[PDB]
């Protein structure tokens, strides 16, 4: 070989040293969202019982017999709120991923003639404790977890039945 080959080798080494990386932030955000999913999954044992024994969905945390919203905290979750049978979990604000900072996800159920279906996805809201339909959050504050930061099994739409 000669000097040209060595220079080309050095250039190739420099090229390989600085290379683009895939979007690994989305996977980390997906991993961190699972904590809020698990924390919200633990409050459905006290909502279904109230609905079954009273005929209407719980209005607040007091009616469902769960702890205070600000007291349901984890490593990346700061609050879990129950409102008209809808469970909303909010992320933290300081030591989290830059993409799921102060964002919310929902967990609601719809009653069928022989089962009670459960849905997971973006935030939704109800209107009355005796209603059977849900609508979008429309918070106008950009507090919705993006689709890319959710599992493929947790992307239900507000009109799903």
């Amino acid at each position: 070989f000669t000097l040209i080959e060595l220079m080309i080798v050095i250039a190739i080494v420099g090229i390989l040293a600085a290379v683009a990386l895939p979007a690994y932030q989305d996977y980390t955000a997906r991993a961190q969202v699972s904590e809020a999913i698990l924390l919200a999954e633990g409050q459905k044992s006290a909502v279904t019982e109230y609905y079954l024994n009273h005929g209407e969905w719980p209005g607040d945390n007091s009616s469902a017999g769960v702890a205070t919203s600000a007291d349901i905290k984890g490593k990346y979750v700061q609050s879990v709120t129950v409102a008209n049978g809808v469970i909303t979990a909010q992320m933290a604000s300081s030591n989290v991923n830059n993409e799921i900072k102060s964002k919310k996800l929902s967990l609601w159920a719809k009653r069928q003639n022989g089962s009670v279906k459960w849905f997971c996805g973006q935030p939704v809201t109800r209107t009355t404790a005796t209603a059977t339909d849900v609508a979008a959050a429309n918070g106008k504050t950009d507090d919705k977890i993006n689709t890319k930061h959710l599992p493929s099994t947790c992307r239900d739409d507000s009109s799903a039945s």
Partner: nanobody, 127 residues
Framework: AQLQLVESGGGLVQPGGSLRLSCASS????????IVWFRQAPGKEREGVSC????????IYADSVKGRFTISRDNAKNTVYLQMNSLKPEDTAVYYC????????????????????WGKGTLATVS
């Protein structure tokens, strides 16, 4: 878990007058409660008048005070106001202020049952 409520603003006014009642609550999480106003006339029993939700976007009234009473909440001063207009001689009673615990600051449930704390009461007579 020792919230206390103080009621002030009562007085004596002629019929057709206006009065402003204020309830001040201090201690721990005072923004997690729903303030409900009661009224007890001599001879009769206690009854509900107005209620306000924790979120502040749900206010209910009584059939006998519809269109004449207004209730507002200001969390900055930790006070809840109840304004009366077009007073009637049949409104002579003692007003009380009490709170109900709701584990959320974004609730919309108002109820007149199962109250926790209470207040001393304020005197309001019209003649």
């Amino acid at each position: 878990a020792q919230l206390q409520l103080v009621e002030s603003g009562g007085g004596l006014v002629q019929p057709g007058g206006s009065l402003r009642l204020s309830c001040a609550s201090s201690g721990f999480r005072s923004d997690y409660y729903a303030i409900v106003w009661f009224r007890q006339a001599p001879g009769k029993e206690r009854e509900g008048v107005s209620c306000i939700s924790t979120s502040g976007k749900t206010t209910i009234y009584a059939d006998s005070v519809k269109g004449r009473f207004t209730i507002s909440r200001d969390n900055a001063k930790n006070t809840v106001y109840l304004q009366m207009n077009s007073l009637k001689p049949e409104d002579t009673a003692v007003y009380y202020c009490a709170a109900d615990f709701r584990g959320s600051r974004l609730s919309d449930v108002c109820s007149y049952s199962s109250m926790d704390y209470w207040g001393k009461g304020t005197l309001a007579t019209v003649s």
